[PDB]
Design a protein around this ligand. Sequence first.
Ligand SMILES: Nc1ncnc2c1ncn2[C@@H]1O[C@H](COP(=O)(O)OP(=O)(O)O)[C@@H](O)[C@H]1O
Ligand code: ALF
Ligand SMILES: [Mg+2]
Ligand SMILES: [Zn+2]
Lengths: 650, 169
Amino acid sequence: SPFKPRNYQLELALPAMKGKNTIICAPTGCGKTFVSLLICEHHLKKFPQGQKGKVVFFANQIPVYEQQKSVFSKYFERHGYRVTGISGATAENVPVEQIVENNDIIILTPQILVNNLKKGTIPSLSIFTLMIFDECHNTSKQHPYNMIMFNYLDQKLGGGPLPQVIGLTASVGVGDAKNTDEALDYICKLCASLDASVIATVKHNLEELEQVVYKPQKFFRKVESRISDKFKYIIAQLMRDTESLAKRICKDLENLSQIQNREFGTQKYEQWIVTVQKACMVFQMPKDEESRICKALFLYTSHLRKYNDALIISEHARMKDALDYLKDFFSNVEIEQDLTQRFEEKLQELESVSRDPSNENPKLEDLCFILQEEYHLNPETITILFVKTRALVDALKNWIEGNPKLSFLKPGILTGRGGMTLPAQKCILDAFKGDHNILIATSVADEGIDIAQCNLVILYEYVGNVIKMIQTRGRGRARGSKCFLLTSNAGVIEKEQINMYKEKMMNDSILRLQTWDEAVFREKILHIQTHEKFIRDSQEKENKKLLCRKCKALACYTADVRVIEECHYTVLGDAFKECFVSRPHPKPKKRAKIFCARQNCSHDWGIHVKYKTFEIPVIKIESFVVEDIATGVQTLYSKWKDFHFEKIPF
Amino acid sequence: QWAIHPTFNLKSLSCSLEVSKDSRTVTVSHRPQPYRWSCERFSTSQVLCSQALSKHYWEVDTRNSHWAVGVASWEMSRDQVLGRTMDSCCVEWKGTSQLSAWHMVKETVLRPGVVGIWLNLEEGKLAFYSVDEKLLYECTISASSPLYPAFWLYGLHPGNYLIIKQVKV
Ligand SMILES: Nc1ncnc2c1ncn2[C@@H]1O[C@H](COP(=O)(O)OP(=O)(O)O)[C@@H](O)[C@H]1O
Ligand code: ALF
Ligand SMILES: [Mg+2]
Ligand SMILES: [Zn+2]
């Protein structure tokens, strides 16, 4: 009620009010949600007595879903329209076939609608009259939005009434253009993909926009690395030693992988290790010596990979975290005794260099400096920090809570479900309206969190396509806000600069497109839709052995595996009941795990679980190598979809 | 007459902040300046005058963003924020476009200008001035340990420099 509609909202609403399928392109923070409110209200009130229509509203991430549902519920309570929502949260849900019919406004996540359409419970899209697509720029190759549109267009082009389509965006996306022409082509293809005739952008009331919406400012921070790293040097020495050990047993392995000049802390090295594994555990010999060599190479490569992960975490996260991870692996888990001696040799030196604060990670130093100086300048402010990986979320949480210098900070974690839950996310969000001052977020904090007060956005080695850049920068709804990209690589800065340009070129291309005459636009859109529909339509149309990946013991055969509930795999038979051994006090204790029978091979196959009445063990294809019963060939399967056999029920 | 002709010290310089060869200029560098790691290093964008003060006057200009000028003892914590600890008393032009004087936990807020500090430890009085001249907040503080002028500069606005101006009688 207290919200007073501004002029530019009416301007944007106009074409949709008329009743054409439209796309709205506006800068972040202008209040496109209120525009959707007004369009929905005007469209619904238009119908005559005795006839009513439905409204559908999607969202990708759960917190966005929750806040949109709350906004709609608060706005439309007074008119008496009944709204509702569906999500993964609702358990034992009433069948949707009629919860669509009972209510007026329905909020969803597109996967639900796609599921129902594929199953067929919802007959056709004609039950609806208005479809609103938030963050509409994602309508592309296989995103669920595009599958919904595929159903829509396949229905329209062949032979019932169809609903109006409205899309909202803050950046339509440029794709991979190298010139204005390809940007124009990409935008035209996008508009065709969702059957829109009009693109609406505010121009008449621009000046009003400038003092209504404050554009955030951008900054870069390059941080150099240390020339001398004791931990890096000693771990690299361990790398050289372990590599020599691995080299000595094998006849050759320089030649096995085409990769060359492998650095130590690079992902290329990790790919090399994975390739050497997948090439060596598949290597066969004419027999116990074969298993022994396989075991030795497996252990060597596993420790190599674990140390490489420790190195990358060390160069990203703080000093202590890498040693924590390594010590946990060693303690939790012959040759392995030798390697344990090797690590325990250096442990104390590693701890000593870790507790020397002079060798602290420079990135953390500069991040402390930025937070300190900002919070000195403004005592009160709400800032968001963006990372790549949840492990880094936990690491930064601990490091922030453990710094006496940053007594100001009050942390709040935020991440996608699976793991924080839905009500926890809702509470953390609502608290910011409160005693929290900093929010550590993963990728879910894009596409609109709408915190009314945010003046600082920090990117911790977080870059990508232009869409992510714009959606990250836009989070600073509060005026005077700033964004800081912190990194230790110049190429990242270059990518950021070129992405800024790409944004500019897209913004010019859309203005060029707006000049085109109507009904030629629609004609070329129809042509593109027809061509793409033709392309898609014509686009598409035993008893083997399984053995332990580490000791090559004959685990089982696919003739004895019965799938339960189409989604779990198990095997019956006393023969399998000897080939493994459980653990007396399993590490989770929260149920007993499976392990290789021979004391030589401590390899985790699967886990126990109980179906309705029966306790049974289940295995993962990630544990075995498959071997033909006729020939001696082998492959490796990482995922049951690739494996092909006689899938048999319980 | 009581005025001294102070100069910066090169032992408490911040890696982000740079000093000229004449040591009469401080400024904010575009990129970090690698320096010796020491327990003395602030790890934050403030510096101290070289001269120790155990009847002395010295004045700085605020022309050319966000600044704090005051007095601090050597026994102050290096990582602590200027003007909020026990040993420090300063005046800062805060981000709300206001000038204020900060005491142990308190902040008395009151148009920026070129500032000056006149101290008399024998009388134990601290006076802040604006040259136009004008007067700022005056206090009665005397420290057992000899003090130094403490200057904090905004650490993210490149091209922002501070010069102590050397007037004569
Ligand atoms: N009439 C109004 N007056 C003031 N603020 C408004 C009004 N209508 C909407 N808003 C603000 O707009 C915000 C929603 O913006 P939103 O559309 O989510 O941004 P974006 O365009 O980036 O998606 C809300 O936080 C609300 O405070
Ligand atoms: F649509 Al937005 F922040 F870009 F809510
Ligand atoms: Mg939005
Ligand atoms: Zn085994």
